[PDB]
Design a protein around this motif. Structure first.
Motif, PDB file in Angstrom:
ATOM      1  N   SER A   6     -37.573 -72.637  19.611  1.00  0.00           N
ATOM      2  CA  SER A   6     -36.622 -73.516  18.796  1.00  0.00           C
ATOM      3  C   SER A   6     -36.422 -72.904  17.403  1.00  0.00           C
ATOM      4  N   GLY A   7     -35.000 -72.323  17.338  1.00  0.00           N
ATOM      5  CA  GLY A   7     -34.685 -71.843  16.206  1.00  0.00           C
ATOM      6  C   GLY A   7     -34.348 -73.003  15.234  1.00  0.00           C
ATOM      7  N   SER A   8     -33.626 -72.481  14.059  1.00  0.00           N
ATOM      8  CA  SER A   8     -33.014 -73.340  13.081  1.00  0.00           C
ATOM      9  C   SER A   8     -31.974 -74.409  13.859  1.00  0.00           C
ATOM     10  N   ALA A   9     -31.439 -75.431  13.006  1.00  0.00           N
ATOM     11  CA  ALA A   9     -30.730 -76.328  13.930  1.00  0.00           C
ATOM     12  C   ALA A   9     -29.336 -75.691  14.634  1.00  0.00           C
ATOM     13  N   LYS A  10     -28.562 -75.052  13.462  1.00  0.00           N
ATOM     14  CA  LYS A  10     -27.503 -74.244  13.733  1.00  0.00           C
ATOM     15  C   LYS A  10     -27.793 -73.342  14.867  1.00  0.00           C
ATOM     16  N   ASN A  11     -28.988 -72.638  15.114  1.00  0.00           N
ATOM     17  CA  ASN A  11     -29.175 -71.646  16.116  1.00  0.00           C
ATOM     18  C   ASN A  11     -28.830 -71.990  17.446  1.00  0.00           C
ATOM     19  N   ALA A  95     -34.771 -73.775  33.571  1.00  0.00           N
ATOM     20  CA  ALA A  95     -34.651 -72.001  33.933  1.00  0.00           C
ATOM     21  C   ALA A  95     -35.596 -71.814  35.100  1.00  0.00           C
ATOM     22  N   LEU A  96     -36.624 -72.408  35.262  1.00  0.00           N
ATOM     23  CA  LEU A  96     -37.556 -72.297  36.245  1.00  0.00           C
ATOM     24  C   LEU A  96     -37.177 -72.959  37.504  1.00  0.00           C
ATOM     25  N   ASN A  97     -36.260 -73.874  37.405  1.00  0.00           N
ATOM     26  CA  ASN A  97     -35.861 -74.909  38.407  1.00  0.00           C
ATOM     27  C   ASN A  97     -34.278 -74.536  38.740  1.00  0.00           C
ATOM     28  N   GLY A  98     -33.799 -73.499  38.663  1.00  0.00           N
ATOM     29  CA  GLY A  98     -32.566 -72.955  39.082  1.00  0.00           C
ATOM     30  C   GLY A  98     -31.478 -72.813  37.913  1.00  0.00           C
ATOM     31  N   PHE A  99     -31.525 -73.156  36.874  1.00  0.00           N
ATOM     32  CA  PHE A  99     -30.653 -72.428  35.729  1.00  0.00           C
ATOM     33  C   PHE A  99     -31.350 -71.075  35.375  1.00  0.00           C
ATOM     34  N   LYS A 100     -30.548 -70.576  34.333  1.00  0.00           N
ATOM     35  CA  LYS A 100     -30.608 -69.432  33.976  1.00  0.00           C
ATOM     36  C   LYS A 100     -31.721 -69.269  32.742  1.00  0.00           C
ATOM     37  N   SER A 101     -31.152 -69.682  31.489  1.00  0.00           N
ATOM     38  CA  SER A 101     -32.106 -69.346  30.376  1.00  0.00           C
ATOM     39  C   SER A 101     -31.809 -70.622  29.517  1.00  0.00           C
ATOM     40  N   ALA A 102     -32.997 -71.082  28.764  1.00  0.00           N
ATOM     41  CA  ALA A 102     -32.947 -72.258  28.151  1.00  0.00           C
ATOM     42  C   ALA A 102     -33.451 -72.163  26.710  1.00  0.00           C
ATOM     43  N   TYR A 103     -33.168 -73.123  25.811  1.00  0.00           N
ATOM     44  CA  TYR A 103     -33.540 -72.908  24.482  1.00  0.00           C
ATOM     45  C   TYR A 103     -33.659 -74.521  23.974  1.00  0.00           C
ATOM     46  N   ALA A 104     -34.293 -74.778  22.870  1.00  0.00           N
ATOM     47  CA  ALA A 104     -34.464 -75.923  22.204  1.00  0.00           C
ATOM     48  C   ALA A 104     -33.780 -75.834  20.701  1.00  0.00           C
ATOM     49  N   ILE A 105     -33.901 -76.891  20.009  1.00  0.00           N
ATOM     50  CA  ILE A 105     -33.584 -76.667  18.542  1.00  0.00           C
ATOM     51  C   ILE A 105     -34.650 -77.337  17.612  1.00  0.00           C
ATOM     52  N   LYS A 106     -35.246 -76.649  16.615  1.00  0.00           N
ATOM     53  CA  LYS A 106     -36.383 -77.356  15.716  1.00  0.00           C
ATOM     54  C   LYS A 106     -35.547 -78.451  14.999  1.00  0.00           C
ATOM     55  N   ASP A 107     -36.737 -79.483  14.779  1.00  0.00           N
ATOM     56  CA  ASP A 107     -36.187 -80.744  13.811  1.00  0.00           C
ATOM     57  C   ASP A 107     -35.137 -81.417  14.630  1.00  0.00           C
ATOM     58  N   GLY A 108     -34.933 -81.294  16.050  1.00  0.00           N
ATOM     59  CA  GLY A 108     -34.172 -82.195  16.738  1.00  0.00           C
ATOM     60  C   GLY A 108     -32.605 -82.682  16.070  1.00  0.00           C
ATOM     61  N   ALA A 109     -32.413 -83.902  15.989  1.00  0.00           N
ATOM     62  CA  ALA A 109     -31.464 -84.426  15.477  1.00  0.00           C
ATOM     63  C   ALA A 109     -31.538 -84.931  14.205  1.00  0.00           C
ATOM     64  N   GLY A 114     -32.666 -80.775  10.906  1.00  0.00           N
ATOM     65  CA  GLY A 114     -32.255 -81.021  12.366  1.00  0.00           C
ATOM     66  C   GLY A 114     -30.965 -81.101  12.411  1.00  0.00           C
ATOM     67  N   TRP A 115     -30.217 -81.302  13.506  1.00  0.00           N
ATOM     68  CA  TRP A 115     -28.895 -81.227  13.859  1.00  0.00           C
ATOM     69  C   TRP A 115     -27.931 -82.018  12.457  1.00  0.00           C
ATOM     70  N   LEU A 116     -28.328 -83.261  12.328  1.00  0.00           N
ATOM     71  CA  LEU A 116     -27.637 -83.979  11.181  1.00  0.00           C
ATOM     72  C   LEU A 116     -27.702 -83.504   9.890  1.00  0.00           C
ATOM     73  N   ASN A 117     -28.883 -82.681   9.467  1.00  0.00           N
ATOM     74  CA  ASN A 117     -29.251 -82.260   8.322  1.00  0.00           C
ATOM     75  C   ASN A 117     -28.741 -80.771   8.295  1.00  0.00           C
ATOM     76  N   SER A 118     -27.677 -80.305   9.065  1.00  0.00           N
ATOM     77  CA  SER A 118     -27.375 -79.024   9.312  1.00  0.00           C
ATOM     78  C   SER A 118     -25.711 -78.674   9.368  1.00  0.00           C
ATOM     79  N   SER A 119     -24.905 -79.491   8.860  1.00  0.00           N
ATOM     80  CA  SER A 119     -23.509 -79.561   8.718  1.00  0.00           C
ATOM     81  C   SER A 119     -22.759 -79.543  10.107  1.00  0.00           C
ATOM     82  N   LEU A 120     -23.559 -80.026  11.129  1.00  0.00           N
ATOM     83  CA  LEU A 120     -22.949 -79.887  12.422  1.00  0.00           C
ATOM     84  C   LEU A 120     -22.219 -81.271  12.813  1.00  0.00           C
ATOM     85  N   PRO A 121     -21.475 -81.198  13.671  1.00  0.00           N
ATOM     86  CA  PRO A 121     -20.536 -82.559  14.084  1.00  0.00           C
ATOM     87  C   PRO A 121     -21.308 -83.512  14.744  1.00  0.00           C
ATOM     88  N   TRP A 122     -20.986 -84.732  14.586  1.00  0.00           N
ATOM     89  CA  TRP A 122     -21.461 -86.011  15.048  1.00  0.00           C
ATOM     90  C   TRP A 122     -20.521 -86.920  15.588  1.00  0.00           C
TER      91      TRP A 122
END
Length: 134
Positions: A6-11, A95-109, A114-122
């Motif tokens: 879990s990187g920063s929201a933009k990560n 990633a362990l169930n047949g996808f490649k490589s997966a990620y999360a976001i800290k602080d969620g939405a 989180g996403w809302l508090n990161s200049s990201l689109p909604w």
């Protein structure tokens, strides 16, 4: 925390657009698209796949993914929780169930950075009038 998870929201959003193959799995409850909205990643290419995670029933959740993604075998998914939830858990299941490589976001939405508090689109619900109502 985990120097790798879990990187920063933009990560996530950054790598969403730059990977061109990446995706979003909004594990937030189906109510949260009523009461907060959804992330507007459409300008990167597409909408997010809303499927509420439930640590309840692993197979009874993954039944939504197998039909939703063309090339899960190289698509880079990014989960998105409300705050913490189990984002980083799902981030090591697909990633362990047949996808490649997966990620999360800290602080969620809705988290303080989180996403809302990161200049990201909604998307949000419809326009309404009553902020103290919710």
């Amino acid at each position: 925390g985990s120097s790798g998870s879990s990187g920063s929201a933009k990560n996530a959003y950054t790598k969403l657009g730059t990977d061109d193959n990446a995706q979003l799995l909004d594990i937030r409850a189906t109510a949260d698209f009523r009461q907060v909205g959804s992330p507007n990643i459409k300008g990167l290419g597409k909408k997010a796949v809303s499927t509420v995670y439930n640590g309840e029933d692993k197979p009874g959740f993954l039944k939504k993914l197998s039909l939703k993604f063309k090339d899960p075998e190289n698509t880079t998914l990014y989960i998105l929780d409300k705050f913490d939830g189990n984002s980083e858990l799902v981030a090591e299941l697909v990633a362990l169930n047949g996808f490649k490589s997966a990620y999360a976001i800290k602080d969620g939405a809705e988290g303080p950075r989180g996403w809302l508090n990161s200049s990201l689109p909604w998307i949000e619900p419809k326009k309404t009038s009553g902020p103290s109502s919710g």
